[PDB]
Amino acid sequence: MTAEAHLLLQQAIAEGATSLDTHEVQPILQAYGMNTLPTWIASDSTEAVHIAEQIGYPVALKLRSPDIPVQGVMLYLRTANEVQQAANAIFDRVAAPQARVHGLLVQSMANRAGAQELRVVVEHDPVFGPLIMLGEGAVEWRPEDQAVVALPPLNMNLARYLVIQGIKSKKIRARSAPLDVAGLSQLLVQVSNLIVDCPEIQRLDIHPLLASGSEFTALDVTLDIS
Ligand SMILES: Nc1ncnc2c1ncn2[C@@H]1O[C@H](COP(=O)(O)OP(=O)(O)O)[C@@H](O)[C@H]1O
Numbered sequence: 001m002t003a004e005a006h007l008l009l010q011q012a013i014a015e016g017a018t019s020l021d022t023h024e025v026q027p028i029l030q031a032y033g034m035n036t037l038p039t040w041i042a043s044d045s046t047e048a049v050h051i052a053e054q055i056g057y058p059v060a061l062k063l064r065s066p067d068i069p070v071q072g073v074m075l076y077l078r079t080a081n082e083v084q085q086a087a088n089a090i091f092d093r094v095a096a097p098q099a100r101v102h103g104l105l106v107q108s109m110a111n112r113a114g115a116q117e118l119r120v121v122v123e124h125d126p127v128f129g130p131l132i133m134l135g136e137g138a139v140e141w142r143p144e145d146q147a148v149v150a151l152p153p154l155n156m157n158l159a160r161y162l163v164i165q166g167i168k169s170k171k172i173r174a175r176s177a178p179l180d181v182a183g184l185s186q187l188l189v190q191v192s193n194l195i196v197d198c199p200e201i202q203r204l205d206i207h208p209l210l211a212s213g214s215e216f217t218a219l220d221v222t223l224d225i226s
Contacts, residue, residue, distance in 0.1 A: 002197060005031045009200045013225055019066055020223040023105060028223070032194040034187065035217045037110060043103035045087030051106040052083045061086050062105040062220075076109065110210055110219055114177040117208035120187075122195055124202065130195045132188060134163075136172060137208035146171055154192035159185035180213050187216050200225050 005028045012020060023039040030036070038055075041064065042048035052059040061074040061083065071093050074086040083106075090104055117137025125131050132150040133143045143149075148166035150159065163184050166172045173179065187209070195201060203224040210217045 001031050005198065009198060009225055013200065018225055020225065021064060021105070022107075022218075022221045023064070025221045025223045028194070028198075029218060029221065032197075033190045034194075035215065036221060037107050037217055037219050039105055039107045041103055042087065042106050043101075045084050045091055048087040048104055048106050049080050049083045052077065053080060055106070055108045058109040059083060060105075060107050060109055061090060062107075063090050063101065064103055064105045065099040065101050067099050110217065111212070112210065114212070116173060116176045116179060116211040118172070118184075118206075118211055120191060120204070120206040120209050122191065122201070122204035132191055132195070134166065134172065134184075134188065148172060150188055150192065152192040152195050154189050156185055156189055159188045159192075163188070178213060179211060180216075183214055183216055184211065202226050 008028060012024070017024070022036060023041055026036045026039060040051045040055075042051055048061060057078045059077045061077060063072045071090060074090065077083045077086055087104060091101070094101070119135050119137050119141065121133045121141070121143065122130055123133070123143075128151060130152050132152065132154070133147040134150070135141065135143070135147040148162050148171055150162055160181055163172070163181050167174045167179070167181075191204070195204070201223060203222070205222040206218045206220075207222070208219050210219055
């Protein structure tokens with residue numbers, strides 16, 4: 001629920017964590033109705049294996065440090081031995097020991113085959129306040145050039161209108177290997193609710209947001225706070 005989200009953000013700030021990653025933001029997103037790929041934490045290659053055994057294979061491993069924007073992501077790990085070899089490779093890759101690793105992110109592999117990858121960024125405009133920007137999942141991000149733009153507070157009616165116009169302008173695809181407009185719109189309203197309620201959030205980046213008809217799932221999430 002929400003009150004836990006504020007306490008989680010305030011305590012992260014007090015501890016000096018100004019950038020929260022996918023495992024840290026998962027309860028905050030869920031308290032606004034948004035789905036995140038379950039994401040666990042491994043300090044040891046022995047722990048990464050243990051997590052992988054529970055999740056079920058295949059698994060991904062990503063380095064939990066405030067550093068990467070080299071190595072870091074290891075996908076399609078299908079066996080306990082592959083997890084251990086990959087965990088040792090990233091843990092030992094470390095390349096000075098000055099990063100506070102805490103450990104490594106472990107998560108199940110998502111079915112991306114027939115799904116669209118979107119991106120949702122929230123940045124602050126000096127005049128207009130928080131801007132929600134929705135575009136296609138990819139490294140190149142020209143927000144002014146190729147993005148749907150919403151200003152909180154967003155209602156479902158305006159969210160749907162902005163998504164439809166974004167499809168018509170070819171900024172977002174109508175479908176690929178059928179984009180549920182009602183679900184993309186609902187997601188934008190949830191982002192808007194979160195931003196309205198949590199002005200601590202300086203930046204929010206869902207990269208990518210996976211679209212599989214009815215289900216929209218955030219695969220990686222970064223939350224900058226101050
Ligand atoms: N758990 C996962 N399941 C499926 N695909 C994933 C998972 N995690 C990351 N990916 C894929 O890895 C790619 C992202 O690679 P990454 O190096 O993290 O990009 P960036 O440098 O932009 O963060 C994307 O294509 C994404 O779809």
